[PDB]
Amino acid sequence: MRSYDMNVETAAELSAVNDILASIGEPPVSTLEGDANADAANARRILNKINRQIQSRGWTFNIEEGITLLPDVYSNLIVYSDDYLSLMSTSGQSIYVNRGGYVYDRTSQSDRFDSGITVNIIRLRDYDEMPECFRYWIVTKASRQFNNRFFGAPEVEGVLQEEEDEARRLCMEYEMDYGGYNMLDGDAFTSGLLTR
Amino acid sequence: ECFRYWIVTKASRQFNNRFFGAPEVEGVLQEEEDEARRLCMEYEMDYGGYNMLDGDAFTSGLLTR
Amino acid sequence: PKEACPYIPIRMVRLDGESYGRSYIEEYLGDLRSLENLQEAIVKMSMIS
Numbered sequence: 001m002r003s004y005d006m007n008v009e010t011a012a013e014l015s016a017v018n019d020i021l022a023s024i025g026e027p028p029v030s031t032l033e034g035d036a037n038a039d040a041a042n043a044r045r046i047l048n049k050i051n052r053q054i055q056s057r058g059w060t061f062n063i064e065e066g067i068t069l070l071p072d073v074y075s076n077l078i079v080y081s082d083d084y085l086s087l088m089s090t091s092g093q094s095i096y097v098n099r100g101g102y103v104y105d106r107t108s109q110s111d112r113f114d115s116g117i118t119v120n121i122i123r124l125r126d127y128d129e130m131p132e133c134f135r136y137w138i139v140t141k142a143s144r145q146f147n148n149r150f151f152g153a154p155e156v157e158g159v160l161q162e163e164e165d166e167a168r169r170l171c172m173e174y175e176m177d178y179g180g181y182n183m184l185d186g187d188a189f190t191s192g193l194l195t196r
Numbered sequence: 197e198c199f200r201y202w203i204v205t206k207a208s209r210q211f212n213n214r215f216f217g218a219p220e221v222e223g224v225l226q227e228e229e230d231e232a233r234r235l236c237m238e239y240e241m242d243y244g245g246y247n248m249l250d251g252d253a254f255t256s257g258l259l260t261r
Numbered sequence: 262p263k264e265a266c267p268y269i270p271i272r273m274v275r276l277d278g279e280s281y282g283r284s285y286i287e288e289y290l291g292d293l294r295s296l297e298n299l300q301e302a303i304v305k306m307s308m309i310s
Contacts, residue, residue: 053235056198056235085198086197086242088243094243094244152220152221154220157220195294196291196292252309
């Protein structure tokens with residue numbers, strides 16, 4: 001699992017943590033560097049948790065289709081990193097699982113590959129790499145969970161519940177606009193049925 | 197990753213019920229587990245790739261002409 | 262003779278400048294494909310049911 005607190009802070013990550021701190025009324029911090037601020041450290045942990053959770057759900061922008069994972073030539077092992085939020089097959093039923101930190105073919109009962117495998121993969125990205133609407137949803141969900149766990153204010157709980165639903169709605173609008181999905185000619189099955 | 201979140205969410209909910217006991221935390225974690233299970237159910241279908249026409253054990257035989 | 266060749270090539274639907282004729286079915290092959298798609302889906306639905 002990637003360490004959230006071991007790299008330099010970005011401006012957006014500084015903004016996100018302070019937004020989470022604001023949810024319970026904590027004043028903003030100038031830096032995420034260790035100042036013994038338990039609240040800021042807790043907020044960053046929840047920010048990382050929510051960042052991993054929403055990305056792992058799967059969206060057109062972050063789902064990578066047709067990605068090749070190359071094996072080591074001498075060990076024939078493909079690493080299944082903890083930053084692989086989702087690893088699927090390109091079509092049909094998926095055959096690859098995680099076994100000991102390496103890719104395992106459950107149908108062939110083998111973890112040895114002579115060549116790269118093509119998978120539909122979600123790889124963890126920085127919160128800085130998220131779209132603006134997705135950043136807002138991550139912060140809103142992190143703020144809601146932060147208040148529930150470390151303050152518990154029931155009035156704050158209700159408003160952040162509504163804010164997250166609105167934040168998730170606008171992320172769904174982004175995903176549909178980004179996807180540009182068509183059930184007539186963008187459809188795997190129906191587009192073939194349209195040929196005359 | 198989705199299953200890890202569901203395990204952690206469900207473990208947190210059971211931990212609160214057993215070793216914290218705050219009822220407002222219970223309602224929060226009940227909501228989170230329901231969402232956490234929903235995303236794992238989405239993962240199961242995407243991984244499963246199940247088809248009732250040709251992937252079906254019985255209907256696939258019925259489709260032969 | 263030009264007019265009495267025992268080999269008679271027949272064209273169902275003759276187009277200008279074409280050595281061969283078009284079939285009558287190909288004028289409606291589009292509807293046949295569309296009906297084929299519907300009929301396949303209707304039968305396959307019954308097989309699920």
